[PDB]
Design an enzyme around this catalytic site. Structure first.
Site, PDB file in Angstrom:
ATOM      1  N   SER B 242       0.819  -1.196   0.000  1.00 57.27           N
ATOM      2  CA  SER B 242       0.000   0.000   0.000  1.00 57.27           C
ATOM      3  C   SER B 242       0.854   1.246   0.000  1.00 57.27           C
ATOM      4  CB  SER B 242      -1.111   0.011   1.036  1.00 57.27           C
ATOM      5  OG  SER B 242      -0.545  -0.245   2.269  1.00 57.27           O
ATOM      6  N   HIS B 272      -2.031  -8.878   1.193  1.00 58.49           N
ATOM      7  CA  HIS B 272      -1.747  -7.681   1.968  1.00 58.49           C
ATOM      8  C   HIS B 272      -2.783  -7.473   3.083  1.00 58.49           C
ATOM      9  CE1 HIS B 272       0.119  -3.970   3.059  1.00 58.49           C
ATOM     10  NE2 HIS B 272      -0.219  -3.213   2.023  1.00 58.49           N
ATOM     11  N   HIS B 318       5.828 -12.981   6.609  1.00 60.76           N
ATOM     12  CA  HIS B 318       6.093 -11.561   6.251  1.00 60.76           C
ATOM     13  C   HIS B 318       7.211 -11.422   5.232  1.00 60.76           C
ATOM     14  CE1 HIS B 318       6.409  -7.159   6.890  1.00 60.76           C
ATOM     15  NE2 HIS B 318       5.146  -7.308   7.286  1.00 60.76           N
ATOM     16  N   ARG B 327       3.399  -5.687  16.460  1.00 60.83           N
ATOM     17  CA  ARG B 327       2.011  -5.251  16.358  1.00 60.83           C
ATOM     18  C   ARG B 327       1.085  -6.371  16.820  1.00 60.83           C
ATOM     19  NH1 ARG B 327       1.756  -3.289  10.305  1.00 60.83           N
ATOM     20  NH2 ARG B 327       2.732  -5.324  10.115  1.00 60.83           N
ATOM     21  N   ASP B 373      -2.125  -9.045  11.112  1.00 59.13           N
ATOM     22  CA  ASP B 373      -3.441  -9.465  10.665  1.00 59.13           C
ATOM     23  C   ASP B 373      -3.966 -10.672  11.410  1.00 59.13           C
ATOM     24  OD1 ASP B 373      -3.729  -7.368   8.824  1.00 59.13           O
ATOM     25  OD2 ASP B 373      -2.291  -8.429   7.519  1.00 59.13           O
TER      26      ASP B 373
HETATM   27  C1  LIG Z   1       3.376 -12.156   3.799  1.00 56.87           C
HETATM   28  C2  LIG Z   1       3.810 -13.089   2.614  1.00 56.87           C
HETATM   29  C3  LIG Z   1       3.127 -12.730   1.297  1.00 56.87           C
HETATM   30  C4  LIG Z   1       5.289 -12.931   2.407  1.00 56.87           C
HETATM   31  O1  LIG Z   1       5.645 -13.373   1.115  1.00 56.87           O
HETATM   32  P1  LIG Z   1       7.182 -13.807   0.818  1.00 56.87           P
HETATM   33  O2  LIG Z   1       8.108 -12.804   1.341  1.00 56.87           O
HETATM   34  O3  LIG Z   1       7.192 -14.207  -0.614  1.00 56.87           O
HETATM   35  O4  LIG Z   1       7.179 -15.114   1.779  1.00 56.87           O
HETATM   36  P2  LIG Z   1       8.307 -16.224   1.756  1.00 56.87           P
HETATM   37  O5  LIG Z   1       9.610 -15.710   1.301  1.00 56.87           O
HETATM   38  O6  LIG Z   1       8.239 -16.853   3.086  1.00 56.87           O
HETATM   39  O7  LIG Z   1       7.779 -17.329   0.717  1.00 56.87           O
HETATM   40  C5  LIG Z   1       8.397 -18.658   0.761  1.00 56.87           C
HETATM   41  C6  LIG Z   1       7.351 -19.690   0.436  1.00 56.87           C
HETATM   42  O8  LIG Z   1       6.561 -19.933   1.634  1.00 56.87           O
HETATM   43  C7  LIG Z   1       5.197 -19.794   1.337  1.00 56.87           C
HETATM   44  N1  LIG Z   1       4.543 -19.239   2.495  1.00 56.87           N
HETATM   45  C8  LIG Z   1       4.890 -18.049   3.067  1.00 56.87           C
HETATM   46  N2  LIG Z   1       4.040 -17.645   3.975  1.00 56.87           N
HETATM   47  C9  LIG Z   1       3.026 -18.613   3.934  1.00 56.87           C
HETATM   48  C10 LIG Z   1       1.852 -18.792   4.695  1.00 56.87           C
HETATM   49  N3  LIG Z   1       1.434 -17.937   5.607  1.00 56.87           N
HETATM   50  N4  LIG Z   1       1.088 -19.873   4.423  1.00 56.87           N
HETATM   51  C11 LIG Z   1       1.479 -20.723   3.450  1.00 56.87           C
HETATM   52  N5  LIG Z   1       2.564 -20.661   2.680  1.00 56.87           N
HETATM   53  C12 LIG Z   1       3.318 -19.592   3.011  1.00 56.87           C
HETATM   54  C13 LIG Z   1       5.203 -18.718   0.265  1.00 56.87           C
HETATM   55  O9  LIG Z   1       3.961 -18.638  -0.394  1.00 56.87           O
HETATM   56  C14 LIG Z   1       6.343 -19.237  -0.618  1.00 56.87           C
HETATM   57  O10 LIG Z   1       5.892 -20.407  -1.345  1.00 56.87           O
HETATM   58  P3  LIG Z   1       6.224 -20.606  -2.914  1.00 56.87           P
HETATM   59  O11 LIG Z   1       7.710 -20.678  -2.989  1.00 56.87           O
HETATM   60  O12 LIG Z   1       5.695 -21.935  -3.296  1.00 56.87           O
HETATM   61  O13 LIG Z   1       5.824 -19.367  -3.635  1.00 56.87           O
HETATM   62  C15 LIG Z   1       3.539 -14.555   2.914  1.00 56.87           C
HETATM   63  O14 LIG Z   1       4.142 -14.815   4.184  1.00 56.87           O
HETATM   64  C16 LIG Z   1       2.035 -14.912   2.927  1.00 56.87           C
HETATM   65  O15 LIG Z   1       1.426 -15.244   1.870  1.00 56.87           O
HETATM   66  N6  LIG Z   1       1.438 -14.872   4.114  1.00 56.87           N
HETATM   67  C17 LIG Z   1       0.000 -15.148   4.283  1.00 56.87           C
HETATM   68  C18 LIG Z   1      -0.880 -13.941   3.954  1.00 56.87           C
HETATM   69  C19 LIG Z   1      -0.794 -12.828   4.976  1.00 56.87           C
HETATM   70  O16 LIG Z   1      -0.835 -13.071   6.182  1.00 56.87           O
HETATM   71  N7  LIG Z   1      -0.694 -11.569   4.510  1.00 56.87           N
HETATM   72  C20 LIG Z   1      -0.661 -10.410   5.419  1.00 56.87           C
HETATM   73  C21 LIG Z   1       0.717  -9.781   5.630  1.00 56.87           C
HETATM   74  C22 LIG Z   1       0.646  -8.431   6.376  1.00 56.87           C
HETATM   75  N8  LIG Z   1      -0.070  -7.365   5.600  1.00 56.87           N
HETATM   76  O17 LIG Z   1       0.391  -7.202   4.576  1.00 56.87           O
HETATM   77  O18 LIG Z   1      -1.120  -6.725   6.110  1.00 56.87           O
END
Ligand SMILES: CC(C)(COP(=O)(O)OP(=O)(O)OC[C@H]1O[C@@H](n2cnc3c(N)ncnc32)[C@H](O)[C@@H]1OP(=O)(O)O)[C@@H](O)C(=O)NCCC(=O)NCCC[N+](=O)[O-]
Ligand SMILES: CC(C)(COP(=O)(O)OP(=O)(O)OC[C@H]1O[C@@H](n2cnc3c(N)ncnc32)[C@H](O)[C@@H]1OP(=O)(O)O)[C@@H](O)C(=O)NCCC(=O)NCCC[N+](=O)[O-]
Lengths: 435, 435
Positions: B242, B272, B318, B327, B373
C-alpha cells in the site's frame, strides 16, 4: 477452433521450466548495483523487474515481444481495406509471443464483442457523476466498481489452488478488455453528448470500430487512427508508472479490475499519461498568447517562460528513452499522410525544431527529445475530438492490452509479492557514515 | 498558535540541505547489488526506496521516526482518562519527527473535525452502491471520486511552481484524513445499519471517538481499541504494497486522493491488508468444521489441509519481518487485559502455539511467525463488529496517516518519478549467457 486459452495452457509449463533452470544456474548472478543516487532518484537506472511482454531500448525504443513498431505495422493483420494494425493482433502477440493469423485475430474480435456488457450498478454510477469530475477519475472508479463481477476474486474466495490463478486472471482480463470501450464511451457521451446512447456492440466488427461507433464518429480515417493509437499505446515495458502499479497491486493478489483501476490512477498523473492532455492545453495557451502562426523567437520565449516558472514542457523527455520516441515518429508519419496542412500539426512540427534545443540549452533534461504524448492529441483534434480532458482515457483503454497480457503471465509464472526494503535518510547515512 | 504547516515550513529547507550535501559526498556509493533472484522474487531484499516516516527492522519490528511501539505507547498523548495513544499524536510524530505536546495533539483533533465534510456527489454514489460490492471497493471508488475537490490537482492545473507542491499536498492530506471516517462510516451504515445516519462531527472529540460514534458503538473500551488500532496500523515503512503504491502513483504527480485510492486497491489484496478479513473467515470455517474447542492434533490437521490445497495460512509470515510482529504482541496484550476469556481469542492463542511449528515443518515460509493481521479481527468481533468483510476498511483508514505523512515529504524533497528498468527473461538470459 481457435482458443487462446488452449494456446497458453501449452506455453505455460514450458516457460516455467525454462525459468526454473535458468534460476538454478544464475539466480545468484549479479546484474547490477544500487547506489545512493538511485534510491533518491526514483530507481532511475535500476534493473528491478521481470516483465515479458515488451522491452524498451533507450536508443531504439520499444519492442513488443522482440518486434519494433515498423515490424508490427508490417506484420500484424489489418482491417479489410485497412492500413493500420488491429490491436486484437497486437494482444495476441503480447500474450503468446507469436504473430497471429488473421483468423486468430478475428477470433479475438469476436470474443471481445461477446463479453462486452455492463452491470447496472456501473451504469448508474456513471450516469450520476457530476460533469466536473475528471474523465480519468470517472474511469478508475467505474473499473473499481466492476470488481463485483471478478471471477478471480470469486475463485480466490472459494480456495482455488494457487496453480490455477492464471486461468481466472485470463477470464477477468478478456472480460475487462471487452468492457473497456463501453465504459469509456458512456463517459464520453454523458459528458459531451448529453441525452444520447452508446448503442450496441456489433459482433461483426473489430474492437476499435465498435469503439468509434460508440464514441459517435463516422470518418473512416478516424477508425484507422483509432486502430493505430490503440496499438501503439499498448505497452511500454514494466517500469513505467501505470504498468508497474498494475504489477505491484496484482502481486498482492488483488483482482485484475482493482489492479487496472490503480494503474489508471498512476496514468492520470501529469508526469505520466495525463501529459497527452497537458500538451494540448499548453498548445492552446500558446496559440492564444501568440496567435496561430508564431515565429521561432517567440516560441522560444514562450518555452522559456514555462521553464522559468518552475514547470515542465509537456511531451518532451523520458525516464528511459534517450532519443526521439518511435511512437512519436509513427504519429508524425500518420499526420504527414493524412493531415499535412493542419495548423496545429504544423505547430507541433515547429516545436520539434525548437523545443529540444531549448531543453539542451537549459541543460537539465537528460532526454531533450519528444515522447509519444507530444503528438497524439493533435491527431485527435483534427478529427473533431476536441475534448482534451478526455485524451488520457484513450491511453488507458490501450494500456489495458499490455498490462493485462503481462498480468496473466505474472500469475502463470508464480511471481511473488512485490516488496522491496525501504530506508530513511538517517538510516542510509549511518549505513555509510553520513554526509 | 499551533500550526503544523508553519512547523514544516521551517523543517523542509534544512532537510533539503542535509540530503543535498549527503548526496554530494555519497551519491555514487553502492549500498547493494541486484541479483537474478531478486528480480524474479518481487525485489525481495532490494534496498529500493527512501521513505522517512518509519523504518522496519527484520528482528525488532517497526520504528516510527526512531520509536518503537512500546515507546509510543509510553510517550504519545492519550485521551483524558485514556490509556491508548491518540493517532493524532502519531501523525504529528511522523510528519515532524518530534513527540507532540497534548496541546499540539488537540490542535490536530480540531483541525480534522473542521475539515470533515462530504460532497453530495460522493454521498450519492455511496447510497447507490449495491450491497454485494466489497467495502474496500466502495472505499476506493469514493476516494477516487473525491478528487474533484483536490487543491493539489487545482494548483497544478494553474501552473504552480514545483517548489510549492508540498503546500497543496499538505492541504489535501489533512482534508483527506478528515474525511476518511465519514466515508468509511457511511459505507458501514449503508451496508449494515440500513436506514440510519452517521450523524455529525463533534469538534470537541478526538478523531477516533468521532469515528466510533459514526460507526454507532458506545462501549468506551471499544473507543480505546479504535485508538490503538488506528495508531498501530499507521505505517510500516515504504516497501509494503500500500505505501509503495501510494509512493509510486504520487511520484507522477497524481493528487493525494488518486494516490491513496490506488493504495487501497493494493491493501485489498489477500496477500496484503485483506488478510485481516481472511483470518476471520478461516477461523469461522475452522470453528465450523471442528467446532469451538479443538484439540491440538485436529488444528494441525486443519492447517495441513490448507497447505496441501495450495493455499496460504492467513496472518502468518512476512516479506521482511523474521520474528513475531510487535504489532501482534501489542494486540495480544490488549486482549489479555480486556477479553482474556473470549473463545476466539483463545483459539487465536492456541494457533500461536501450533501454526509456526507446522510452517517450519513444511519448510517453505521464511518467517513462520504471526503478523498483525492474525490478531486484529478477533479484537473487533468481541466488541460486536462481526462484519468481517469490513475489517480492511479500518486498516485503510489507519494507513492514510503514514502514507500521507510521507507523501508531503516526497514532494517537499523533490523526489522524482519512480521509474525502474524492466527486463524480459529472454533479455536477462542474454545479459548473462542463459540457463
Ligand atoms: C506475507 C507473505 C506474502 C510474504 O511473502 P514472501 O516474502 O514471498 O514469503 P516467503 O519468502 O516466506 O515465501 C516462501 C514460500 O513460503 C510460502 N509461504 C509463506 N508464507 C506462507 C503462509 N502464511 N502460508 C502458506 N505458505 C506460506 C510462500 O507462499 C512461498 O511459497 P512458494 O515458494 O511456493 O511461492 C507470505 O508470508 C504470505 O502469503 N502470508 C500469508 C498472507 C498474509 O498473512 N498476509 C498479510 C501480511 C501483512 N499485511 O500485509 O497486512
Ligand atoms: C518524463 C520525465 C518525468 C522523466 O523524468 P526524469 O527521468 O526524472 O527526467 P530527467 O532525468 O531528465 O530529469 C532531469 C531534470 O530535467 C528536468 N526536465 C526533464 N524533462 C523536462 C521537461 N520536459 N521540461 C522541463 N524540465 C524537464 C527534470 O524535471 C529534472 O529537473 P530537476 O532536477 O530540477 O528535478 C520528464 O522528462 C518530464 O517531466 N517530462 C515532461 C512530462 C511528460 O512529457 N510526461 C510524459 C512522459 C510519457 N508518458 O509517461 O506518457
Amino acid at each position: 477452433s481457435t482458443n487462446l486459452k488452449d494456446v497458453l495452457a501449452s506455453l505455460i509449463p514450458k516457460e516455467q521450466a525454462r525459468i526454473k533452470t535458468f534460476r538454478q544456474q544464475h539466480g545468484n548472478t549479479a546484474v547490477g548495483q544500487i547506489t545512493v543516487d538511485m534510491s533518491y532518484g526514483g530507481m532511475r537506472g535500476m534493473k528491478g523487474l521481470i516483465y515479458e511482454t515488451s522491452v524498451l531500448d533507450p536508443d531504439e525504443g520499444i519492442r513488443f515481444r522482440g518486434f519494433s513498431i515498423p515490424e508490427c505495422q508490417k506484420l500484424l493483420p489489418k482491417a479489410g481495406g485497412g492500413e493500420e494494425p488491429l490491436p486484437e493482433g497486437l494482444f495476441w502477440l503480447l500474450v503468446t509471443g507469436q504473430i497471429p493469423t488473421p483468423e486468430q485475430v478475428s477470433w479475438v474480435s469476436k470474443e471481445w464483442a461477446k463479453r462486452a456488457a455492463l452491470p447496472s450498478h456501473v451504469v448508474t454510477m456513471l450516469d450520476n457523476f457530476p460533469t466536473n469530475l475528471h474523465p480519468m477519475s470517472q474511469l478508475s472508479a467505474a473499473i473499481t466498481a466492476l470488481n463485483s463481477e471478478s471471477n478471480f476474486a470469486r475463485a480466490y474466495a472459494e480456495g482455488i489452488n494457487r496453480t490455477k490463478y492464471w486461468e481466472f486472471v485470463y477470464e477477468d482480463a478478456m472480460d475487462l478488455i471487452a468492457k473497456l470501450p463501453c465504459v469509456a464511451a458512456k463517459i464520453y457521451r454523458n459528458l459531451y453528448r448529453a441525452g444520447s446512447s452508446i448503442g450496441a456492440i456489433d459482433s461483426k466488427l473489430d474492437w476499435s470500430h465498435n469503439f468509434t461507433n460508440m464514441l459517435g464518429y463516422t470518418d473512416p480515417q478516424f477508425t484507422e487512427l483509432m486502430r493505430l493509437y490503440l496499438t501503439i499505446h499498448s505497452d511500454h515495458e514494466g517500469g513505467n508508472v501505470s504498468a508497474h502499479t498494475s504489477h505491484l497491486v496484482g502481486s498482492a493478489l488483488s483482482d485484475p479490475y482493482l489492479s487496472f483501476a490503480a494503474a489508471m490512477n498512476g496514468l492520470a498523473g501529469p508526469l505520466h499519461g495525463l501529459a497527452n492532455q497537458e500538451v494540448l492545453l499548453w498548445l492552446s495557451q500558446l496559440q492564444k498568447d501568440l496567435g496561430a502562426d508564431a515565429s521561432d523567437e517567440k516560441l522560444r520565449d514562450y518555452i522559456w517562460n514555462t521553464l522559468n516558472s518552475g514547470r515542465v514542457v509537456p511531451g518532451y523527455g523520458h525516464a528511459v528513452l534517450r532519443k526521439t520516441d518511435p511512437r512519436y515518429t509513427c504519429q508524425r508519419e500518420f499526420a504527414l499522410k493524412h493531415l499535412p496542412s493542419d495548423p496545429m500539426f504544423k505547430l507541433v512540427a515547429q516545436l520539434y525544431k525548437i523545443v529540444p534545443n531549448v531543453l539542451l540549452e537549459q541543460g537539465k533534461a537528460k532526454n531533450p527529445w519528444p515522447n509519444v504524448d507530444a503528438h497524439s492529441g493533435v491527431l485527435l483534434q483534427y478529427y473533431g475530438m476536441t475534448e482534451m480532458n478526455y485524451y488520457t482515457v484513450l491511453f488507458g483503454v490501450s494500456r489495458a492490452l499490455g498490462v493485462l497480457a503481462q498480468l496473466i503471465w505474472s500469475r502463470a509464472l508464480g511471481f511473488p509479492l512485490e516488496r522491496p526494503k525501504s530506508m530513511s535518510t538517517a538510516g542510509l547515512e549511518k549505513l555509510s557514515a553520513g554526509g
